[PDB]
């Protein structure tokens, strides 16, 4: 299958530099154009740069010209985006995509995207607290429980339940930005009341920017 | 540069309906227009290219057409999994440019929320802050009012809401409201109450606990 | 300033959809009328009623 995988996004200070990679597989980038496209609150979807690896021709959006460079290493079937002199408005999800693959004159594969956060604030790992089931979180023979993932920076945080085996009834809320400048989110799951105390419930929290991995077991409260 | 003007910005229809969204180029782009879908937490996915041609693997209920500089995307029988954002893109001149997007929501019947409340955990309480979480599960429509009361006094400015997008099976929303206090203030009061107002409820629901009880 | 024009799209078979257009009042107005015209091609002639000083519309299609 055709696959594009971006890597390299992360926190960077205003004025700083970052380098993104786009590793392709299942086709040869010498046969297509490769583009970078970003997506941000202020501009939505916004094309950044393209390169035709066979001849090295490149084009750039006016707003990044001189600050970013696109390149490609065909021997590694990989393309790159050097980003210098970064500004707050460069904060975005950065996607790489192909164009002209198999004669299709559209961007028919996109990577999962990588998040670039331009800010002077520093990394901070979250605290993970249980949302314990109780008489105040049950009705109709089902019971809600969860995990509060509080005070982290920057995005993103991922949550799974029982190493991804538990997905039915899971709601992981979008993170909120607290007035402290730190993010916070909750993930809840609804389960049979009768399973509480026989079935183990664990939220697997990963915050890669701070190398925080937490596997928190959530149980009903003692008394 | 060429701009792509998409309308409506938001469209909400029932399962099975025919929905039509539009995109207008600011000058001639021939047929060099594509349409992308974006689902929650996802990357843009190609649906239609060159104005009218279906990308391989895309359900045939999607279709596109062109009329001069006006382009239309049609979903002939809206499915729950079509709940997503839709973007048009011209590639006729450099820079390629995208429309501002149309958000497509699914209509369904009213459903009142399950309302649950969670005191601060003991772990959190060891270190100076208390978060109180009110949970509204699986309701529709999205509009809802959550008010916090602490010992019967209405709270303002110390709570924050988060809302999921429409669920994959049942097209409902869920919502969390978190009340944040100092540990000191939390232990200074007794009754913590979440009051929920929603179209599916015959009158507002109050879910509360007394700090310290079991 | 920025306004949001809310629209009910009422089809002859009684199905109802809702849509929003945002922009200046004149931009949002022009876009709603243009969208109604386009839908009228497939769904029949439209009439548009304007409650709330124009900020809400009911757009019925003849079928």
């Amino acid at each position: 299958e055709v696959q594009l995988v971006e890597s390299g996004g992360g926190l960077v200070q205003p004025g700083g530099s970052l380098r993104l990679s786009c590793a392709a597989s299942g086709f040869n980038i010498k046969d297509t154009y490769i583009h970078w496209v970003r997506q941000s609150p202020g501009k939505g979807l916004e094309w950044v740069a393209r390169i035709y690896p066979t001849n090295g021709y490149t084009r750039y959006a006016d707003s990044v010209k001189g600050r970013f460079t696109i390149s490609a290493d065909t021997s590694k079937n990989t393309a790159y985006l050097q980003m210098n002199s970064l500004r707050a408005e460069d904060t975005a999800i950065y996607y790489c995509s192909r164009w002209g693959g198999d004669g299709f004159y559209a961007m028919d594969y996109w990577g999962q995207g990588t998040l670039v956060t331009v800010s002077s604030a520093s990394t901070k790992g979250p605290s993970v607290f249980p949302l314990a089931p109780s008489s105040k979180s049950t009705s109709g023979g089902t019971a809600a429980l969860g995990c509060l993932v509080k005070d982290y920076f920057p995005e993103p945080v991922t949550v799974s339940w029982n190493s991804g085996a538990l997905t039915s009834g899971v709601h992981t809320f979008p993170c909120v930005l607290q007035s402290s400048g730190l993010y916070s989110l909750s993930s809840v799951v609804t389960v049979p009341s009768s399973s509480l105390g026989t079935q183990t419930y664990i939220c697997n929290v990963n915050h890669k920017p701070s190398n925080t991995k937490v596997d928190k077991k959530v149980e009903p409260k003692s008394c | 540069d060429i701009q792509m003007t998409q309308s409506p910005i938001l469209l909400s229809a029932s399962v099975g309906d025919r929905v039509t969204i539009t995109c207008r180029a600011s000058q001639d782009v021939n047929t060099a227009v594509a349409w992308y879908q974006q689902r929650t937490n996802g990357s843009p996915r190609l649906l239609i290219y060159s104005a009218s041609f279906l990308y391989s693997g895309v359900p045939s209920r999607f279709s596109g057409s062109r009329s001069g500089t006006d382009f239309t995307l049609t979903i002939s029988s809206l499915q729950p999994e079509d709940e997503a954002d839709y973007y048009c893109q011209q590639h006729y001149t450099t820079p390629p440019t995208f429309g501002a997007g149309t958000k497509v929501e699914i209509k369904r019947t009213v459903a009142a929320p399950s309302v649950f409340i969670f005191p601060p955990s003991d772990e959190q309480l060891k270190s100076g802050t208390a978060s109180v979480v009110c949970l509204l599960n699986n309701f529709y429509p999205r509009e809802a009012k959550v008010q916090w009361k602490v010992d019967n006094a209405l709270q303002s400015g110390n709570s924050q809401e988060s809302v999921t997008e429409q669920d994959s099976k049942d097209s409902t929303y869920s919502l969390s409201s978190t009340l944040t206090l100092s540990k000191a203030d939390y232990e200074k009061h007794k009754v913590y109450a979440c009051e929920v107002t929603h179209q599916g409820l015959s009158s507002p629901v109050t879910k509360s606990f007394n700090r310290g009880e079991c | 300033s920025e306004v949001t024009i809310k629209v009910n799209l009422i089809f002859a078979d009684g199905k109802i959809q809702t849509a929003e257009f945002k922009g200046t009042f004149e931009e949002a107005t022009a876009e709603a009328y243009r969208y109604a015209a386009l839908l009228a091609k497939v769904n029949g002639e439209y009439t548009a009623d304007l409650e709330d000083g124009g900020n809400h519309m009911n757009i019925k299609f003849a079928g």
Partner: peptide, 12 residues
């Protein structure tokens, strides 16, 4: 509407 980085969805 407003694109939201956390969800990758328009917020209307």
């Amino acid at each position: 509407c407003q694109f939201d980085l956390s969800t990758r969805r328009l917020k209307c």
